[PDB]
Write a protein that binds this ligand. Structure first.
Ligand SMILES: [Cl-]
Ligand SMILES: [Cl-]
Ligand SMILES: [Cl-]
Ligand SMILES: [Cl-]
Ligand SMILES: [Fe+3]
Ligand SMILES: [Fe+3]
Ligand SMILES: [Fe+3]
Ligand SMILES: [Fe+3]
Ligand SMILES: [Fe+3]
Ligand SMILES: [Fe+3]
Ligand SMILES: [Fe+3]
Ligand SMILES: [Fe+3]
Ligand SMILES: [Fe+3]
Ligand SMILES: [Fe+3]
Lengths: 178, 178, 178, 178
């Protein structure tokens, strides 16, 4: 029985480029987390309590996704390499602009997973594509959800009255088309 | 005991023009169904989640009405003839325009039933008028409901803020005067 | 943030040939639905109440599958295009012939999904293959089920007594190998 | 306040031909009752216990229908006139022949109601058409049910084995398409 790079028994070696891609993606999940924390704060600073609570939960969820990836590397007997985390964006001129950044962040998360997915297929790593399949499925739902929140905020067309109604929806947990 | 056109024992023959009228009306119910599906999609594309859920349920209800009619022909030992279904309308410039089409669709459904009703009376088919009586009663309630939804949307006068409030009413199931 | 063809925020563009293939497949699910409705009617006309109830439920399930696909296009910010629906087949000389058509309809549904799947892989659309994966899994179970119902009816070798026993199985919900 | 023919306060006079038609129809319901009793006995004599129980209940139901009509005449302040009741048919060469007589008996019951209905319309007696409307609705269901039982027995094509299976269905209360 061979030992993998993290010291555990190795079921099958992993291509180093694929390992680096996964380590890089863990950073993207962690960056999404701190970005949603920043967005939560921006919302709280403007008394948008429902948006604040939504993004506060979204930040914890993104961290959970990152940890989920670290567990996969452990399972594959590969080393984790937790990286320096950039500071998030923290300033937006409107809620609509913030929600656009949030949507792009989800689309960018999926793109990163897709890039890892393509590299795993290049290396015939079926464990990794199977591991990523449910995460892409969750990304479709997340993109649908953030397209819903962004589009609903844009529908409000900057009217504070409409944004308060949407804010109360989010505080109630009404955060998807349903 | 005579056998009816669908092969079952025949309680009483049905005039072929009346049969064709019923088969035609089944198509109208099926067309109402796919129209409400199209309207549900239009609403979902604009993040009008409550209107989407309402029309999604309305589409299933219209299909149930169609099946209810096929069961009556079975009960009368008459042949069903499921027809080609036209594509629905799929484009509207506003929610108010969509709701106007929806109201007209309900009024047109009732007109079709009324036409079948008149033909059954011409042929002294009391089974068919008795069968249609509760369906006309349900049409009155449906017309009242869609006049309510259309009128409430028109009252909003295109204000997104008011349409969001109405959207949330529909998501809660507040879809009639009550 | 770019807007997709249906107006929603776009996470990633979709190849137009892949979009048309998905729109075409939605038609196949809707056609399976009306085909199972026709089969339900054929069974009811022959007092095969269990087969009638089975196909009545199967028709609603196929419609649900179609709606599931329309929701995916919404999630991808792609336009739906609900198409004209052909009239179903409505005449069979025996229950065994009807069940053969039903089995082929399920196999043909899977073939259509497989064709969409191959086109998504050609375009590296991992969202679409992930979306279709569970639907292919459900197709395996559906093909297993309809091979079971077809084979059991063929085992009956046209004996009405055996078909009544099977009819009662279906009315009880005994519709799979289990 | 005028007194009606049965002595009670009279809300509106009834045409004597319409009264005789209703009195005649009460006889038809009573005759259906004793016919179903005879059919129950025929079935019991052949150990068809499920068919026996079905027709035993059907006989009581027909009597209830007759009483329902006598109550309407009371409500209209009209005299009842309970008539001599013919002896039922009591001999059949097969269960299929018996079920054909049963189906015709239901169709004939509806025809009698229809004849009363037409006479009430001739006399603009809207109380009577309203009273008969739900009874015609029940007749549609009864005709559907007896077409189902007759057709299922005919499907058995005289095989005792199939008739035993159907007999057990009826004993379990499985007496309609459902
Ligand atoms: Cl805004
Ligand atoms: Cl509007
Ligand atoms: Cl067969
Ligand atoms: Cl027989
Ligand atoms: Fe994530
Ligand atoms: Fe995310
Ligand atoms: Fe999978
Ligand atoms: Fe309808
Ligand atoms: Fe309707
Ligand atoms: Fe009525
Ligand atoms: Fe399907
Ligand atoms: Fe299927
Ligand atoms: Fe009766
Ligand atoms: Fe009866």
């Amino acid at each position: 029985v061979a030992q993998g790079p993290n010291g555990r028994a190795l079921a099958e070696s992993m291509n180093p480029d694929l390992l680096s891609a996964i380590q890089q993606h863990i950073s993207i999940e962690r960056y999404a987390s701190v970005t949603y924390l920043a967005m939560s704060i921006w919302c709280a600073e403007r008394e948008l309590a429902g948006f604040y609570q939504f993004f506060d939960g979204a930040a914890k969820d993104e961290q959970s996704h990152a940890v989920h990836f670290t567990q996969y590397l452990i399972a594959r007997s590969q080393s984790n390499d937790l990286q320096t985390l950039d500071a998030p964006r923290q300033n937006w001129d409107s809620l609509a602009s913030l929600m656009a950044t949030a949507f792009q962040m989800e689309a960018d998360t999926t793109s990163s997973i897709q890039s890892v997915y393509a590299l795993a297929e290049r290396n015939s790593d079926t464990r990794t594509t199977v591991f990523l399949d449910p995460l892409i499925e969750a990304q479709i739902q997340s993109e649908d959800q953030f397209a819903y929140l962004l589009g609903r905020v844009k529908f409000a067309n900057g009217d504070p009255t409409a944004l308060l109604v949407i804010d109360n929806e989010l505080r109630a947990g009404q955060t998807q088309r349903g």
